[PDB]
C-alpha cells in the first residue's frame, strides 16, 4: 500500500505514535517519507547483508527475522514480511521498541539526516487528525 501523507498520519496517530517517546507525529511521517516514500512494500538491502523492511525500514539484523541475516536478532519477534503488510500495526509496534532502546529516532539514519531539527509539523499540515 502506498499511503497518502495524511492517511499515514491518521494511521500512526490511531496506533499511538504521536508523541511516543516525545516524538511528535510529524517526525514519524517525515521518517516514513524518506525511509519508504510511504510504501509498505519497500525493501532495501544494506551493505552488511541485512535488509530494511516496510514503511519505517526496520532492519533484520536486530528487529525482525528474514531467514537470511546471519548472526542477527529478531527483537520484535516478527517475520520481516509482516512489516510489509497494508496494515501498519506490526511496523508501529516494532518502531515503538526501536525508539525506546536508547538513541530515540536517531536509529533512523534518514530521520537524523533529513528530519531532525526541521520543521516537521509541515508533514501533518492540512490533515484532519
Ligand atoms: Cl509534528
Ligand atoms: Cl530487497
Ligand atoms: Cl536470519
Ligand atoms: Cl519468522
Ligand atoms: Cl493501518
Ligand atoms: Cl540519509
Ligand atoms: Na534477524
Ligand atoms: Ru490498523
UniProtKB/Swiss-Prot annotation:
GO terms for cellular component: cytoplasm; endoplasmic reticulum; extracellular space
Annotated C-type lysozyme domain residues: 1-129
Catalyzed reactions: Hydrolysis of (1->4)-beta-linkages between N-acetylmuramic acid and N-acetyl-D-glucosamine residues in a peptidoglycan and between N-acetyl-D-glucosamine residues in chitodextrins
Superkingdom of the organism of origin: Eukaryota
Keyword Disulfide bond among UniProt keywords: yes
Tissues/organs with expression: In the egg white and polymorphonuclear leukocytes.
Keywords: Allergen, Antimicrobial, Bacteriolytic enzyme, Disulfide bond, Glycosidase, Hydrolase, Secreted, Signal
EC number, as in UniProt: 3.2.1.17
Main EC class the enzyme belongs to: hydrolase
Pfam families: Lys (PF00062)
GO biological process, one term: cell wall macromolecule catabolic process
Binding site residues for substrate: 101
UniProt cross-references to PANTHER family, sorted A to Z: LYSOZYME C
Protein role: Lysozymes have primarily a bacteriolytic function; those in tissues and body fluids are associated with the monocyte-macrophage system and enhance the activity of immunoagents. Has bacteriolytic activity against M.luteus.
Family stated for the protein in its record: Belongs to the glycosyl hydrolase 22 family.
Quaternary organization: Monomer.
Note: Lysozyme C is capable of both hydrolysis and transglycosylation; it also shows a slight esterase activity. It acts rapidly on both peptide-substituted and unsubstituted peptidoglycan, and slowly on chitin oligosaccharides.
Protein name: Lysozyme C
Amino acid at each position: 500500500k502506498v499511503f497518502g501523507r495524511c492517511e499515514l498520519a491518521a494511521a500512526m496517530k490511531r496506533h499511538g505514535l504521536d508523541n511516543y517517546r516525545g516524538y511528535s507525529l510529524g517526525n514519524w511521517v517525515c521518517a516514513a517519507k524518506f525511509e519508504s516514500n510511504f510504501n509498505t512494500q519497500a525493501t532495501n538491502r544494506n551493505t552488511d547483508g541485512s535488509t530494511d523492511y516496510g514503511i519505517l525500514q526496520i532492519n533484520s539484523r536486530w528487529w525482525c527475522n528474514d531467514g537470511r541475516t546471519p548472526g542477527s536478532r529478531n527483537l520484535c519477534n516478527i517475520p520481516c514480511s509482516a512489516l510489509l503488510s497494508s496494515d501498519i500495526t506490526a511496523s508501529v509496534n516494532c518502531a515503538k521498541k526501536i525508539v525506546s532502546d536508547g538513541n530515540g529516532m536517531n536509529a533512523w539514519v534518514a530521520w537524523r539526516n533529513r528530519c531532525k531539527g526541521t520543521d516537521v509539523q509541515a508533514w501533518i499540515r492540512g490533515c484532519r487528525l
